[PDB]
Each structure stands twice: as C-alpha cells, then as structure tokens.
Amino acid sequence: AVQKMTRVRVVDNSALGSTPYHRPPRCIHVYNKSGVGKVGDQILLAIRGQKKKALIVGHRMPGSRMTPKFDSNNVVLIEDNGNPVGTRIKIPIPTSLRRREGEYSKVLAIAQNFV
Amino acid sequence: VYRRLGLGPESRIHLLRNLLTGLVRHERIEATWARADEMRGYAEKLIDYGKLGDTNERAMRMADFWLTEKDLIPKLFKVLAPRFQGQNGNYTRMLQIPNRKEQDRAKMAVIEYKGNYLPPLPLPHRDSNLTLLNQLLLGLQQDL
Amino acid sequence: LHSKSSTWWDEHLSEENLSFVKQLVSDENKTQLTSKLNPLKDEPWPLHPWEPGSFRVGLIALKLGMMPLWTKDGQKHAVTLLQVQDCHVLKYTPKEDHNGKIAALTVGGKTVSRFYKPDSRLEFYRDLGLPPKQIHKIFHVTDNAVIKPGTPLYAAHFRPGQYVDVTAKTIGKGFQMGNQNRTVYGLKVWRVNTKHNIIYVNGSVPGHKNCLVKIKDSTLPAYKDSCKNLPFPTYFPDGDEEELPEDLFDESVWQPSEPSITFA
Amino acid sequence: RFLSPEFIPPRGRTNPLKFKIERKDMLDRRKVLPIPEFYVGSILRVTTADPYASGKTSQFLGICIKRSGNGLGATFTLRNTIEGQGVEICFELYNPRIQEIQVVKLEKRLDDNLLYLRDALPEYSTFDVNMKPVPQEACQEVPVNKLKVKMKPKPWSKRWERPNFNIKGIRFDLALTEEQMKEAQKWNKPWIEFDMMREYDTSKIEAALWEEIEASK
Amino acid sequence: AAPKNRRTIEVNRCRRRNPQKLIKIKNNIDICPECGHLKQKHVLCGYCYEKVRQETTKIRQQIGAQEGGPFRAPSVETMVLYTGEKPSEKDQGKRIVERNIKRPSWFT
Ligand SMILES: [Zn+2]
C-alpha cells in the first residue's frame, strides 16, 4: 500500500536509482483516482533530488488470496515518453500486470524474473 | 458471552475462584442471582475435569488454581467426581431466592451441587395429573 | 384475591400431559401441512395465460448466510444463501378492495409456535388450515396471476439467472440506529437447491443471519417482463409437469465435481 | 485418522444444513482434485491454472506457514523466498483453478503458525523451488522440525515475546534478555489458561465427521 | 438550572399525577401451599426456605465441630444422620454427621 512517505526501494538500473543516496525516499504522488498505490499503479518518486514517474511492482500490504505478499515495496521508473527509465528489473515481478488495465507491456518486456 | 464483573478480568476469575471454593466446601451457597448464573457454567465444567480422572495432570493445575484450599482437591477427585459419574450433566442446581432486604434490593439465588447431603431445597412442583384439566387431557390421550 | 392472574401454557400442564401436548402439536402440524401439499387437487382457482404487464407473487425466505461460489471462468464470487420455509398463500385481496391499480396477495412463511401467540392469529390460521407464520407480507399480483389461498410456494418459483429484489430490516445497533426496512435491487440468482429450497443470490442482503426477508421479482425497467419464460403464476410441484433437478445451476456457475478449470 | 481442519465446524448459530451441503461439495471436489494431508511447516508444491497466462499452468513451492478458513472456503498459506523476496501465497483448497497439490516435504514445525519466520533469518525461510519430494513413512507421524529460528533485530512485525503469542520456535534468549521477557510477561493473563468458558470441544464432532467423509468415498 | 419563573403548583401537580409517574400494580402475586404465605409465581417461598437454611447452619455447625480443624475437608462422601437413625453398611466409607434432632418430616 503505497501512500504518503512509505520508504520504498527503487528496483531499477537507472542512474539516479542505481547510485546510492543518503536521503530516504519520500514518494510524492500516486497516479490513481484513489489515494492508495498498489502493484501496477503509477506513482511519482523523488530520487537524487529529482522527480521521476515510477510503477509499483510489489507491496507489503496484505493481498488477495492466491497471491504472493511481498516483503518489500518495489518500484520501476518510467520515462515521460512511456518507455521505462531503466532497461532492466531485478526483483521478481508479478505477471498480473499484463492483464491489469493500462500500459504494462514495456515494463514486462524489461522484467527478467517473473513469479 | 461474559458478564462485565470485577475491577478487571483477573478479579472476575479470582472472585469466581472465591465463589467456586466456597461452593465446593459447603455444596450450597447463597449469592446474587447474576453471580450464581455466571459461575454455574464453571462448576459444571469443573465436575467434568474431576470425571476426566484424578491422574490427569491438567486437572490438578486447574483444580489447584481454582481451589485455594487444597483439602478440597482430594474431595473433588474422590467425592464430587465419583458422585457425578452416573450423571452426564446438570450437576449444579440454581434457584432464585427473594431479593435481599439490605436497602440495595439485589437479585438473590442459591446454587448447590446435586447429590449433596444437605436437606432438599423446596423445589417447584408441576400440577398433578389428577386435576380436572389434566384428567380431561388424559381422556384425549387415551382415545388417541 | 378476586383478581386477574398471570398464566402460561405450561403452568397447569403436568409432565405426562406436557409430553402428550408436544406430540399432539406435532401431529396437527404434520396433518395440516400434508392437507395443503396439493393445491391443484384442492379446487384450484382458474389459471390464466401470461400477457405483458402481469406481475407474479413474491416469497419470504430465511437468510442462512454467505459462502464462496465459483464460476466456470475460475473466478470466486461470494454468494448469500436464502431458504424458503413454509411459504404459503394466506389471504387474497380483490383489486378494487385493496388498490385500484392492482390486487395483492398475502404470503407468510417460517411457521412459528402456537403456545405464545394471540388466539386471534390462531383463529385466522385455523380457517386457512395452516400453522401460524412468523411474518405476514403483502405482494401486488395481477388478476391473471392470482392463486387460491393455501397454495404452497417453493424456491423453484424463481430460477437461476434471474435478477431479484430483496427487502429486509437492517440490523439494529441501538442508541449511538439501524432496524430500518431497506431493499437491495438487481441481485442475480446463481443456483437454487430444490430439496431444501435454498436460493443462491449474488451480493449481500441486509440483516443478520437467520433473518427473514421478502423476495420479489426485479422491478428494474430492463427486467420488466421476465415471468414470460418463467412459471407464470408460480411453480407447482403438485402438477409435476417435469421434475426439476434437486440443485439448479446457472450456466456460468462451475458445479462441484466438475474438472479443475484450466484457463486455456 | 487425519481429519482436515476445514471439515470441523466452528461454534455458532449457523445452520448445520449449510455444513452438510458444504461438505458434499467439498467431498465431491476432493474426487476431482486430490488434497494431500499436510501440516504447517510442510513444504508443498501446488499446481494451479494461470488466469493471466493463456493455457499455461505453474507450480509454486513453499513451506506451509498457516492454515485458515473452514468448509469449502478454507485456505492454506505456504511461504518461500524467491530471488531473495519472501512470498506467501494463500491457496484455497477447493478453488477450481488449483490443478494439483503435491506435498514435496511432509513435516511439521515447532509452532502451528510460522508468521514469525518473516522476522527470522532468511535461510530458515529459504527453500529451493525445484527440490524433489523427500521420502515419507505412511505408518508414522509427520516429522516435526524442532530447529529454533534466529530473529532479526528487536523491531518486529508482531511482539512474539509476549505470552499471548507464546511462540516456542524463536531463539528469544539470544535476542532478548530475561528482563525483557518479564516486561512481556506483564501481559501473561494467567487466568486465561485456567478459564473454562473459552474451551470448545470438537472431539465428538471430529469423530463423527470421519465416518461421514469415509462413507462418501 | 432554574426556569425563568417559579413553577406553579398546578403545573407541578399535573406532572407528578401523570400515570407514567404513578406506582403500578402487580398481578403476579401467588400463594405458597408449603408455607401458606404469599409468593411470586417466579419466586420461591422464603418461609419454607428459611427452615432449610436454618437446618443447614445447624448441620454445618455439627460438621465443623467434628472436623475439629481448618482445611480438613474429607476426601470421602458425607452423610447426615438424625436421632433414631443409626449408621448402616451403606453409610460405610462416607463421613457421618449425627444430629441430636429427630429426622425432620420435610427432610427425607
Ligand atoms: Zn412455603
């Protein structure tokens, strides 16, 4: 359940995300009609003093039955043009994003590990 | 499913422990109706623990805690448990007594262990079949 | 004192007579119900063919609870359980004498004990030849769909796949509330159990478990005339034109014992 | 005689008829899909139809950490760490989309609930997805793993040290001092273990269920 | 809180004489055949019950003297015997309480 604050982990090879930084990440905006951000929901993340759009791929909030509950909040950065900021994703990514309404093929085309 | 009694959850059990210990010692106790009803379930379940067996180690821990006076522990396994072996339940008889005339008008009841040596309580009696209405019902029963 | 005294049915009953009284009550209930089992064999009122604008009678059912139900698509749908108990037509009101627009039929279910009920209620039911029912409700029924009083009504009146409207009193919460009649509209029926007269209805229904509810055909404009393809007056087991399956399922519903669904 | 938890009804005012109907569906489904006997702590591999994928099934392996629900709606949760990510999946026993259920390793753990494994070290929770089934002895009890897991730093999801949780599979001594236990023990509520009002007996119900289940077979 | 003017006795008289505030009569009064005294239909007679408690206190007093010490509850069954009744073989293996009074008519 991504929401105000909610320390997150940037699962991407983007230069801003890849480089370690002292400041804990305070996510700003959730790109949904509702205020809660879950897997597959676009969000705005502040990394390295910059603002970049991110896509949630995992959360620690209890989920529906028959689904894996992640132990860490995982996100993937997406450019303004719609292409992912990073060319690779390391954490296992649920395959439900394909059926989820929206544009998720590009991110799935970047996710090596599927669970 | 539980009455809100005592200054805390411990007090209710301790108060129930005090009530349970007294009833076992005397086998007939007069108390407020609400308390008697609340503790009636515990007393019946305690008899089941006695029926479970004296050798049952768990029963001793329950009996030891609930019964402050330890002389009662042999009594439960050797008096109460043998007494109720035939019975499958209803070990305790609770009846309503007129409210205390102590200016607070508390609802009073008497709870006793069945099979006790104490004099029988004045229980209510249903109407005899010799009554006119019962005799009329008897005729209907015979015809059917 | 030459004054009134308070009495109950068991006050003057002896143990031997009390046991007999229970047996007698059971015998009366059995005999009365069996007598009313066959409506069509008891001089039924004339039944008319369906025409547009006809309205069928509703039923009263008990809310058993909710359980998960699965469809052939593999999705899980929570469904609420409604049981029709001792549903019988009691009193018919003429169109003019009740409402100029339409006539109404009174239906009562969930038989109740006779010991703690007023004699007036028992007197009416004695004429009807049925044991007293917990709730009396009025349903607007057209003249063509009128059914003779005392006709048993079963869950088979409704069929799987039909949307229905359920109205029931909401759970009361005390001073803080609730305990108000409310209606839920557009609930589809997933399955009906004929043997136990259990109807499986999509969604939740107001009220607590084991709470009586009123069930009537959906009044939404889209489902204006659904009774054309359904038993128009009602389903008569007495007629036995075709014995229905014990459990009625919707086509999408995945019956238990079917092969495991594979998403191909 | 192993009676699965779901068959046992809970105390309440619910109609017994509902359980009978629910059991019939459960028993009939069990013929279609075999539900092997397993306990919390057992590693299971479950085959399930994939809705997101088209005409593809998958198998997920994890240690059974918790069992919940009753009747047809009963579910079981098995945990594993995949690519370094702890994952717990709650599988409904009678869901038609479960193609097959395999108990790769039938065993029990110290506690009936293994949610504390999240706070334990990852290795205790790590299991190979491709691990082959290990041998089992039919005329024996399921092996009970008595290994005590080591916890991560004191901040945990839940205060397992409290008497309410009463976890026996945690190496509290290593991570907790005796004084901390006493602070936790302030919530002992010793009267609770001695209260007979919280006791519910299903032994008679469990015994009766066995014949009904076998009769249906 | 006081009303802006004194409440008239007429106004006050109506309030106190409203039926809602008056004392209600009870019709559940019953007679006890056992004591011949009044009782409620849901309440047991106290005149007879008083005898039981008084006898119980006397019986309890005899038991206390026989035990002779605190925490001396027997592990064996207990029985009460009155004058004119002597311990029998069936009474063996049971604590026996002896009462100077003869067997009460009500007690059996
Ligand atoms: Zn008397």
Curated annotation (Swiss-Prot), chain B:
The chain holds residues 14 to 157 of 176 of the full protein. Belongs to the bacterial ribosomal protein bL17 family. Disulfide bonds: none annotated. The gene is Mrpl17. Its main location: mitochondrion. The keyword Lipoprotein does not apply. GO terms for biological process: mitochondrial genome maintenance; mitochondrial translation; translation. GO terms for molecular function: protein domain specific binding; structural constituent of ribosome. GO terms for cellular component: mitochondrial inner membrane; mitochondrial large ribosomal subunit; mitochondrion. It is found in: Mitochondrion. It comes from Mus musculus (Mouse). Keywords: Mitochondrion, Ribonucleoprotein, Ribosomal protein, Transit peptide. Component of the mitochondrial ribosome large subunit (39S) which comprises a 16S rRNA and about 50 distinct proteins. This is Large ribosomal subunit protein bL17m.
UniProtKB/Swiss-Prot annotation, chain C:
GO terms for biological process: mitochondrial translation; translation. One of its GO terms (molecular function) is structural constituent of ribosome. The keyword DNA damage does not apply. It is found in: Mitochondrion. Keywords: Mitochondrion, Ribonucleoprotein, Ribosomal protein, Transit peptide. Gene3D superfamilies: Translation factors (2.40.30.10). Its main location: mitochondrion. InterPro entries: Ribosomal_uL3, Ribosomal_uL3_bac/org-type, Ribosomal_uL3_CS, Transl_B-barrel_sf. GO terms for cellular component: mitochondrial inner membrane; mitochondrial large ribosomal subunit; mitochondrion. Component of the mitochondrial ribosome large subunit (39S) which comprises a 16S rRNA and about 50 distinct proteins. PANTHER family: 50S RIBOSOMAL PROTEIN L3, LARGE RIBOSOMAL SUBUNIT PROTEIN UL3M. NCBIfam families: L3_bact. Belongs to the universal ribosomal protein uL3 family. This is Large ribosomal subunit protein uL3m. It comes from Mus musculus (Mouse). The gene is Mrpl3.
UniProtKB/Swiss-Prot annotation, chain D:
GO terms for cellular component: mitochondrial inner membrane; mitochondrial large ribosomal subunit; mitochondrial ribosome; mitochondrion; nucleus. Transmembrane segments: none annotated. GO terms for biological process: mitochondrial translation. It is found in: Mitochondrion. One of its GO terms (molecular function) is structural constituent of ribosome. Keywords: Mitochondrion, Phosphoprotein, Ribonucleoprotein, Ribosomal protein, Transit peptide. The keyword Transit peptide applies. The modification Phosphoserine is found at residue 4. Component of the mitochondrial ribosome large subunit (39S) which comprises a 16S rRNA and about 50 distinct proteins. Belongs to the bacterial ribosomal protein bL19 family. This is Large ribosomal subunit protein bL19m. It comes from Mus musculus. The lineage of its organism: Eukaryota, Metazoa, Chordata, Craniata, Vertebrata.
From Swiss-Prot, chain E:
GO terms for biological process: mitochondrial translation; translation. The keyword Ribosomal protein applies. It is found in: Mitochondrion. Zn(2+) binds at residues 32, 35, 45, 48. Keywords: Metal-binding, Mitochondrion, Ribonucleoprotein, Ribosomal protein, Transit peptide, Zinc. It comes from the Eukaryota. Coiled coil: none annotated. GO terms for cellular component: cytosol; mitochondrial inner membrane; mitochondrial large ribosomal subunit; mitochondrion. Component of the mitochondrial ribosome large subunit (39S) which comprises a 16S rRNA and about 50 distinct proteins. Component of the mitochondrial large ribosomal subunit (mt-LSU). The mitochondrial ribosome (mitoribosome) is a large ribonucleoprotein complex responsible for the synthesis of proteins inside mitochondria. Belongs to the bacterial ribosomal protein bL32 family. This is Large ribosomal subunit protein bL32m. It comes from Mus musculus (Mouse). The gene is Mrpl32.
